[PDB]
Design a protein around this ligand. Structure first.
Ligand SMILES: *[C@H]1O[C@H](CO)[C@H](O)[C@H](O)[C@H]1NC(C)=O
Ligand SMILES: [Ca+2]
Ligand SMILES: [Ca+2]
Lengths: 5, 229
């Protein structure tokens, strides 16, 4: 999954 | 221009510039740092580049290196890359940017000047990469213009793997062959005019980044360029 945006 | 070098191992690290979290270790290039217990440090990037610049106008090259990925659990990140960029290129963002891009601009091809062959151990949701670990060719974007599946058997094998990267200056083609002892073989090519992207100087080297649970070690490295004349 997304982890730093 | 014409340049060649050879490191059968890295017992000497004589013309290597280290930046960020990269350092020499047990006759290798360790691209990302470890703590006092040997555990990989989260969210770091490191560069090990050959310090002498060269030019790409009217030039072909061949380079080969050996490498090991060491993982300490399931979900390692983020990988490493062999890259070409200008001589003043800084270590850029850790994580899935691989030390080669900044978040703002990482997919904008007109805001970057960097070409790489990436070994990517983490599937980034943030720019919808393909759903597997992969090897790829990057041209001014963290979104690989050409990409192929990198088998997990091989990622986690802890073998000393071999990469061959070569650029034909006449046909304007960059190509990577990657091989694993009793493992997989990988082939990628892309038409790209490196002399047009890099009209001046460049340096070649390695960028690694975490991420988590991962250390990237280069064991050997040779390079030869020659003029196409
Ligand atoms: C976010 O975290 C993971 C590790 O959990 C990876 O480092 C991934 O590449 C990171 N995201 C970005 C955008 O760097
Ligand atoms: Ca990638
Ligand atoms: Ca990734």
């Amino acid at each position: 999954g997304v982890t730093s945006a | 221009s014409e340049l060649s070098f050879n490191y059968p191992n890295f017992q000497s690290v004589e013309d290597i510039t280290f930046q960020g979290g990269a350092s020499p270790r047990n006759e290798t290039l360790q691209l990302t740092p470890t703590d006092s217990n040997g555990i990989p440090i989260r969210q770091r990037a490191g560069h090990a580049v050959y310090s002498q610049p060269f030019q790409l106008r009217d030039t072909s090259f061949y380079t080969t290196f050996t490498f090991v990925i060491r993982t300490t659990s399931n979900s390692p990140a983020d990988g490493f890359a062999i890259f070409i960029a200008p001589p003043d290129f800084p270590v850029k963002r850790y994580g899935g940017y691989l030390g080669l891009f900044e978040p703002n601009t990482a997919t904008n091809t007109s805001a970057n000047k960097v070409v790489a062959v990436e070994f990517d151990t983490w599937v980034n949701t943030e720019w919808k990469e393909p759903r597997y670990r992969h090897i790829g060719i990057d041209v001014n974007s963290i979104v690989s213009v050409r990409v192929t599946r990198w088998q997990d058997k091989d990622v986690f094998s802890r073998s000393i793997a071999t990469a061959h990267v070569g650029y034909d200056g006449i046909s304007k083609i960059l190509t990577a062959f990657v091989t694993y002892p009793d493992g997989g073989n990988y082939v990628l090519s892309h038409v790209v005019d490196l002399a047009e992207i890099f009209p001046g100087d460049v340096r070649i080297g390695f960028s690694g980044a975490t991420g988590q649970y991962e250390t990237q070690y280069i064991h050997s490295w040779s390079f030869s360029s020659t003029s196409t004349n």
